[PDB]
Nucleic acid binder design. Structure first.
Ligand SMILES: [Mg+2]
Ligand SMILES: [Mg+2]
Ligand SMILES: [Mg+2]
Ligand SMILES: [Mg+2]
Ligand SMILES: [Mg+2]
Ligand SMILES: [Mg+2]
Ligand SMILES: [Mg+2]
Ligand SMILES: [Mg+2]
Ligand SMILES: [Mg+2]
Ligand SMILES: [Mg+2]
Ligand SMILES: [Mg+2]
Ligand SMILES: [Mg+2]
Ligand SMILES: [Mg+2]
Ligand SMILES: [Mg+2]
Ligand SMILES: [Mg+2]
Ligand SMILES: [Mg+2]
Ligand SMILES: [Mg+2]
Ligand SMILES: [Mg+2]
Ligand SMILES: [Mg+2]
Ligand SMILES: [Mg+2]
Ligand SMILES: [Mg+2]
Ligand SMILES: [Mg+2]
Ligand SMILES: [Mg+2]
Ligand SMILES: [Mg+2]
Ligand SMILES: [Mg+2]
Ligand SMILES: [Mg+2]
Ligand SMILES: [Mg+2]
Ligand SMILES: [Mg+2]
Ligand SMILES: [Mg+2]
Ligand SMILES: [Mg+2]
Ligand SMILES: [Mg+2]
Ligand SMILES: [Mg+2]
Ligand SMILES: [Mg+2]
Ligand SMILES: [Mg+2]
Ligand SMILES: [Mg+2]
Ligand SMILES: [Mg+2]
Ligand SMILES: [Mg+2]
Ligand SMILES: [Mg+2]
Ligand SMILES: [Mg+2]
Ligand SMILES: [Mg+2]
Ligand SMILES: [Mg+2]
Ligand SMILES: [Mg+2]
Ligand SMILES: [Mg+2]
Ligand SMILES: [Mg+2]
Ligand SMILES: [Mg+2]
Ligand SMILES: [Mg+2]
Ligand SMILES: [Mg+2]
Ligand SMILES: [Mg+2]
Ligand SMILES: [Mg+2]
Ligand SMILES: [Mg+2]
Ligand SMILES: [Mg+2]
Ligand SMILES: [Mg+2]
Ligand SMILES: [Mg+2]
Ligand SMILES: [Mg+2]
Ligand SMILES: [Mg+2]
Ligand SMILES: [Mg+2]
Ligand SMILES: [Mg+2]
Ligand SMILES: [Mg+2]
Ligand SMILES: [Mg+2]
Ligand SMILES: [Mg+2]
Lengths: 197, 147, 122, 54
RNA sequence: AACUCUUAGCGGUGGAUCACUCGGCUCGUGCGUCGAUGAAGAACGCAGCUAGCUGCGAGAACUAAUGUGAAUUGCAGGACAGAUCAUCGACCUUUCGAACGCACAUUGCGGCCCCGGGUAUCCCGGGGCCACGCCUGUCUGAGGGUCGCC
RNA sequence: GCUGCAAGCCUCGACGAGUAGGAGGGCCGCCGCGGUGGCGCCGAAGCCCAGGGCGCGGGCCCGGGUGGAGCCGCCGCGGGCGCAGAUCUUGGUGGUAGUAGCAAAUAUUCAAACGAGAGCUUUGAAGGCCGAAGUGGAGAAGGGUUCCAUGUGAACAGCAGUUGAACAUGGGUGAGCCGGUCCUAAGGGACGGGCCUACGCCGUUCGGAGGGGAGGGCCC
RNA sequence: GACCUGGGCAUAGGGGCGAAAGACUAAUCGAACCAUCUAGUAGCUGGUUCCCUCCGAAGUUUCCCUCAGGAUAGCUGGCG
RNA sequence: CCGAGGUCCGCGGCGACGCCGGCCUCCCACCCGACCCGUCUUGAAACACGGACCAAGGAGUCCAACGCGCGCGCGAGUCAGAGGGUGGCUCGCGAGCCCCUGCGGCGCAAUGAAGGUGAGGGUGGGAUCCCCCCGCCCCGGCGGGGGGCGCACCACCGGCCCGCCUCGCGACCCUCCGGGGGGCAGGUGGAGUUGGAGCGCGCGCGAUGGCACCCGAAAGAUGG
RNA sequence: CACGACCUCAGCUCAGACGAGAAGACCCGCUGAAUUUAAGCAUAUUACUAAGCGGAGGAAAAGAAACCAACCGGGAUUCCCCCAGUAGCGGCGAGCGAAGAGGGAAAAGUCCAGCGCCGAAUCCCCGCCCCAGGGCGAGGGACCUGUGGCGUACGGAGGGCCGCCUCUCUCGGCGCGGGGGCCAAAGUCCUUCUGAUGGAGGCUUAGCCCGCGGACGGUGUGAGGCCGGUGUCGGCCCCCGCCCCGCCGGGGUGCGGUUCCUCCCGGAGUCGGGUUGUUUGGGAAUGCAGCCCAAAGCGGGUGGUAAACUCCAUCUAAGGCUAAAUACCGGCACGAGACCGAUAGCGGACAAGUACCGUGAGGGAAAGUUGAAAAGAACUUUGAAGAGAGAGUUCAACAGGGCGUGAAACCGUUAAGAGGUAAACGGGUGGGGACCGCCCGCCCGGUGGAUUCAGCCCGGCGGGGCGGGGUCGGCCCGUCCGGUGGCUCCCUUCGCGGGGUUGACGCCCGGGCGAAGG
């Protein structure tokens, strides 16, 4: 079979693959189908945003996506408590909640509490009955100027803040970056063998 | 397409470009990588040395996000900032130095391959090689570490 | 130009539902235009032909100003038979020749309780 | 169709008969019995390299 | 002469080719609904003239209703000509079949109730029933199984 | 003067075998598509030709005949794109060939009738055979109208046919005491139980609270 | 007579049944038939469809449970 | 005109089909040549196989991935893929257009089993080009003689990076418990480096996995 | 030794329900091969496939963490992309092969048991009363061997304190799409041609006429205007629905905040361990199952290498429910096609799963076309009849019923020629035959007839340019200066959205410049 210099190929076609072949001929048809579902859903929730509830801002786990934020699953119960929002009333006003997530640092906590407060100001709540405007309900002036919000509810901004050009201190120029990492790696390996003393 | 196909010029020729003596049959030497050690050994040893056997330790649950460490050389270090920024601070070499945060650009380690222009620069990376730092220190500037 | 994607434009389908059309649909298919005096009197372009209509052949071998009367509307064969539009057979027997309704022109309508209702809607 | 030409339970008669060693339809009282069924050269058989939808 | 062969015309034999296409194949879309209230499938039967196909079920080539508005057509004949067709919400829907009284290479063999007739008796006909498993409940019971009362 | 489609044109020199195989060119051919340029009842496609031609060739044009409704060039695009072979597939047709053959169980003949038509039907006579372990008379299984009358003589009945188990049109199978039905024979197969992941299987008078009937009038 | 025979029954495929021949088990038996896996695999036979133009071989090397086959080098063509 | 290959400024009989022309093709005849194709084979006209005849059908395909060559776009980038947006009651148009804070793929860094560490020119040949000098000129160039910068590429010699080995081991400012450095040098291993070339699309071909150019087993298995 | 209660277990053609079978493309649970590849072959591969068995639904399954991760942490499930032909598995051979993260589609969460409070506060059956929604019965049961309310890992409950206050469900009545019928523009104008026009030409030179209709089909040929339709969310008519708002009516019952008190907080032959078989990329054992062992409660599971110790992280297993993204070769109803065009395409364009074959499981064809219209050949005549000759229909019988076109093989006949070396074939020619085929141009010299007759002039108009029209003028684009003046600026320094400095930044403005153009 091998004729001359070339790769050792490994085509995984030793099963009965012809019985399981999915052609993407309905791919443009499911785009029309999923689009009609969003439009049909949009009319069913006409005042409410079509994208769903407000999602929090979470940090991607691994080091490969260290500096990357992402729309999370739901707001932590601690983030709702620090924003004055009850657990079981957040779903009624379109706020995503999940109780599995925790806040390991205040940076992630304060980032979503500000996001919750920014949302509640931009939130126009309609009274349960138009003849009875209650306390938490918005005023009759803001109800007329309330349209459906298309796109993600409060998309996450990635502020590309730049460190200002400073003057390099002489103490900063004497910092051995290679020796600092090389000592940190060596001390992290001999840490356990040193604690035995 | 089939217009420029070779089979269109093989009409009329009996063996269809596969010989009369040795006909074109069903796998005359085995299917796939058969005989890689017995009768295709010369081909495997000549063009794929090292194909047979084991080498090195095994890592069962290898997660590529753990060993993720994209690198960048010093010759492409100033590509992370605008060209006007590199020129503006060239006329002001008396302490105002730009900061090139290599982590926010998508790299972790800085390697000292190319030459660096004679400008003080503050380089923020998670890792530095010995020569990358001394070229940054030699040209003026510090190598700030980040996590 | 057809803008309705639910209506077919196909040689295979338009012919199948034409030669297999039900009798009540073949009535609408076997329509014939009205004369310029009837089209001006009733303000109707064409009409589904009936048995006792006076028509006039316009195309074919039997065309002419002779105003005949429909004998029967052979809805199964997509053809009508007129009084004097006929032919002598070999044995001398006279047989009616089939004419398609699209080739005749209704010079006089067979008005009844239902014909005047449809003429009003048109 | 993927089943085009393969709706037959044809077995080759083999050698020993003047027939040409092609899968022939099982016996019966029809014209179809004893006819080539599978190959692309046979009438009513499967075309060479049937056009697949993928 | 004949016979044989070649060539062309013509005529046969044969069916190619071409043109045609109410068919297939493939893709996409919307729905996504069977059955003891008897399904799928099967058998038999049903038309004025009817074998098959198809449609129906002893109301049998269709009933009612609604829409439609003059036909169906091979030949008649006949329309209470609202013809015909479509829709299809009413009604109808033989036997076998999960098929259900027991069976079945049997239109075999039984049982119960009710009705009508001959006359409760029997006989005849008709109607409603009588499979298996299981659930809730009722009813009727069983066992010193555990007690109570004596 | 001519060209100059420069992917064109012109000049000069040498060279030319070829299986397997490779490459190039094709204004070779086929089907469909996007363009473009047309053709057609004053006759398209296809088919036929002792007609006129073109190209090294693949092939092509024209004329004539037939045919009766579609078709083609060019620039691109997409192929189920070209056959002499495969004991190829399907269909058709030859030579063999008016050939082999219509040769198992002794047999037919005369006359007449019907009829367009008779070795073959029918009638009579004659001479023969089966010779009651029939070439006879009735059933079972199986066949399913083959039974019967009449008509037909296309097809079939391997010659014929006025004949038929053919075809066409009608008709025909009548039961308390003939059989089925009733009984269990071998056996099959439920039930209880057990098994089985299950569809189910095992097992057959055993094995369950397996009796649905009483006499006596609420009792055994 | 260890006879012949009908019908009804029983035994079903790696099973049956066999006074035994590998016999018989629906013209099929040293493992029935039917459908499917299955277009099973075949280093083995057979065939592999238009033209012209140009170039043009090898049956030798090494390795191979190889010796009717491959890998490999050589020879070939094309692209430059 | 013995001269850059031919002209006649020579001519005859018949010309309307009787008596003219038609290569090839049709028939026939003669001379020369000439065994039946396909196939396997060292060798086929073979007493080798297949083929009585004719029509129609009939066999290198599609998918995946790879290699190299080529066309194309852009270029240290390249491709937008899933998806989303929308000429708004959606033909042609299940196209096309658009944006995705370009996720990611493949490139831009290799090397080691790994912990890890991680890349600074010379010589020779060299298309092309530059300069000078002497002649000639139709002022645009031509001819002759010299020098030089040297593309790509190749040969060689280096530098550097990672692995390994050997040698050199030292005093010293980064030690801050622990620890990190200490021109190290000389060799050697690497699919490296010393001024990127790739990515996407298309095309062709080759070797593959798939029914895989087509037809073909003796079987084996599952269910009946 | 009966009578009662209970337990356990029976009977019924008891009252009222349920199950069965079909189909099975997609889906769930099992079972399970071998062809095949490894050029043999045994593990492996084929394949956790085919076949076999069971069970569903319009989707199913899955699913709200005994998860991932090791980070600045993610956060149910499903699907897509990528991860990735990667980690890894493998006679480490052939081959096999996921997952976390990331990007997207869709997103919705929750109920018990237990724990302990509430007079079982609960349910069913029967008989009913009012308007599917509410009630009643000194009716019968279920149930304390545990119904209901509260409540479930996000903590929960009760009592204080603080604050705001009661709003769902289901019916009647006025306001905000779907389906089925019916209808809705314009040539049969003129001329010609044809068997038939739907062909050709014309219709002030707006093709004549319509056009939001020039899709498609039918009609005797290529029809926008003959017909059905097509286009117009155009009109009319009849059924029917969703959502929101408002009033009336039957059922609804408050919820939050507490660096305050008190109390409560969990799924056993299960985890785990051993072993066995199988499965997986899971490798000192991924999942599953059998057997054995057999738990704990600051416990248990996991942290991809077996083990002990230790620290950290994460989850809370052994109970239940749950839409939407996803699949769909079956079914129902549609649309489409660079597909096939009667040996093709499904086996089946037709009385096709039909005829027919086999005892049976099963096997399984062949077969489309007269013409526009049957106008399907009256009648005469020969024959017993098929079959003929006439006649007749048709544009056509070179369309006469398996009838459009009618090829090749093969055959009859006619015409022509030939034939003692089987026939054919290459090259050369001959004969014959059948059908065909066949002096002008430029210039000039005279000649004789006609020149809405020539140079030139005048008048009107049009056109032409780097081997070179010249002189004035704008305009467009590129480019460079003049910053001539403020908006983005440079992610540009300063005080806390305002101000100050500069980039070949764009627009504005004047000059340049380019064989850059009109
Ligand atoms: Mg090879
Ligand atoms: Mg060749
Ligand atoms: Mg060959
Ligand atoms: Mg080849
Ligand atoms: Mg060989
Ligand atoms: Mg191959
Ligand atoms: Mg109209
Ligand atoms: Mg033979
Ligand atoms: Mg086929
Ligand atoms: Mg000849
Ligand atoms: Mg002929
Ligand atoms: Mg029934
Ligand atoms: Mg040559
Ligand atoms: Mg094709
Ligand atoms: Mg000829
Ligand atoms: Mg082909
Ligand atoms: Mg052939
Ligand atoms: Mg009869
Ligand atoms: Mg006979
Ligand atoms: Mg008779
Ligand atoms: Mg008889
Ligand atoms: Mg008969
Ligand atoms: Mg017997
Ligand atoms: Mg067997
Ligand atoms: Mg023996
Ligand atoms: Mg094959
Ligand atoms: Mg050989
Ligand atoms: Mg000729
Ligand atoms: Mg051969
Ligand atoms: Mg030999
Ligand atoms: Mg010999
Ligand atoms: Mg032979
Ligand atoms: Mg052919
Ligand atoms: Mg290669
Ligand atoms: Mg990228
Ligand atoms: Mg990759
Ligand atoms: Mg150099
Ligand atoms: Mg085997
Ligand atoms: Mg079922
Ligand atoms: Mg093998
Ligand atoms: Mg092999
Ligand atoms: Mg084997
Ligand atoms: Mg299966
Ligand atoms: Mg269902
Ligand atoms: Mg769904
Ligand atoms: Mg579910
Ligand atoms: Mg596997
Ligand atoms: Mg993931
Ligand atoms: Mg939970
Ligand atoms: Mg039309
Ligand atoms: Mg396995
Ligand atoms: Mg570990
Ligand atoms: Mg569930
Ligand atoms: Mg067919
Ligand atoms: Mg079908
Ligand atoms: Mg004709
Ligand atoms: Mg004809
Ligand atoms: Mg014909
Ligand atoms: Mg002839
Ligand atoms: Mg002759």
């Amino acid at each position: 079979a091998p004729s001359r210099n070339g790769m050792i190929l490994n085509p995984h076609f030793h099963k009965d693959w012809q019985k399981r072949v999915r052609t993407w001929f309905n791919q443009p048809a499911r785009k029309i189908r999923r689009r009609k579902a969003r439009q049909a859903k949009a009319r069913r929730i006409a005042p409410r945003p079509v994208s769903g509830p407000l999602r929090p801002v979470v940090r991607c786990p691994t080091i490969r996506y260290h500096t990357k934020v992402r729309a999370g699953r739901g707001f932590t119960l601690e983030e709702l408590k620090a924003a004055g929002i009850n657990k079981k009333v957040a779903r009624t006003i379109g706020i995503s909640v999940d109780s599995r997530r925790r806040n390991r640092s205040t940076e992630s906590l304060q980032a979503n509490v500000q996001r919750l407060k920014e949302y509640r100001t931009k939130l126009i709540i309609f009274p349960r009955k138009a003849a009875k405007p209650k306390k938490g309900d918005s005023t009759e002036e803001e109800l007329k100027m309330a349209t459906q919000l298309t796109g993600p509810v409060m998309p996450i901004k990635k502020v590309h803040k730049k460190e200002k050009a400073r003057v390099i201190s002489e103490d900063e120029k004497n910092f051995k970056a290679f020796a600092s990492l090389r000592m940190a790696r060596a001390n992290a390996r001999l840490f356990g063998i040193r604690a035995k003393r | 397409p089939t217009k420029k196909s070779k089979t269109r010029k093989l009409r009329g020729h009996v063996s269809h470009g596969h010989g009369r003596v040795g006909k074109h049959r069903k796998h005359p030497g085995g299917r796939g990588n058969a005989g890689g050690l017995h009768h295709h050994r010369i081909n495997f040893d000549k063009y794929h040395p090292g194909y047979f056997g084991k080498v090195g330790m095994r890592h069962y649950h290898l997660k590529r996000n753990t060993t993720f460490c994209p690198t960048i050389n010093l010759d492409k270090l100033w590509t992370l900032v605008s060209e006007q920024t590199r020129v503006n601070y060239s006329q002001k070499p008396d302490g105002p130095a730009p900061i090139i945060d290599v982590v926010r650009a998508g790299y972790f380690k800085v390697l000292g391959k190319g030459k660096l222009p004679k400008q003080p620069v503050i380089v923020k990376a998670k890792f530095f090689s010995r020569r990358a730092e001394e070229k940054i220190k030699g040209v003026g500037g510090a190598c700030v570490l980040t996590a | 130009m057809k803008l309705n994607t639910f209506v077919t434009s196909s040689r295979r389908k338009n012919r199948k539902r034409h030669f297999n059309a039900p009798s009540h649909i073949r009535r609408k298919i076997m329509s014939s235009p009205l004369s310029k005096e009837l089209r001006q009197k009733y303000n109707v372009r064409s009409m589904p032909i009936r048995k006792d209509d006076e028509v006039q052949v316009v195309r074919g071998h039997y065309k002419g100003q002779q105003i005949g009367k429909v004998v029967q509307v052979y809805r199964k064969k997509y053809v009508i038979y007129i009084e004097r539009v006929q032919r002598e057979k070999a044995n001398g027997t006279t047989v009616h020749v089939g004419i398609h309704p699209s080739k005749v022109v209704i010079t006089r309508l067979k008005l009844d309780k239902d014909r005047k209702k449809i003429l009003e809607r048109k | 169709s993927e089943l085009a030409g393969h709706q037959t339970s044809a077995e080759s008669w083999g050698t020993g008969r003047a027939v040409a060693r092609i899968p022939r339809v099982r016996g019966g009282g029809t014209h179809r019995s004893g006819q080539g069924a599978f190959g692309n050269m046979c009438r009513g058989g499967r075309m060479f390299a049937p056009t697949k939808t993928w």
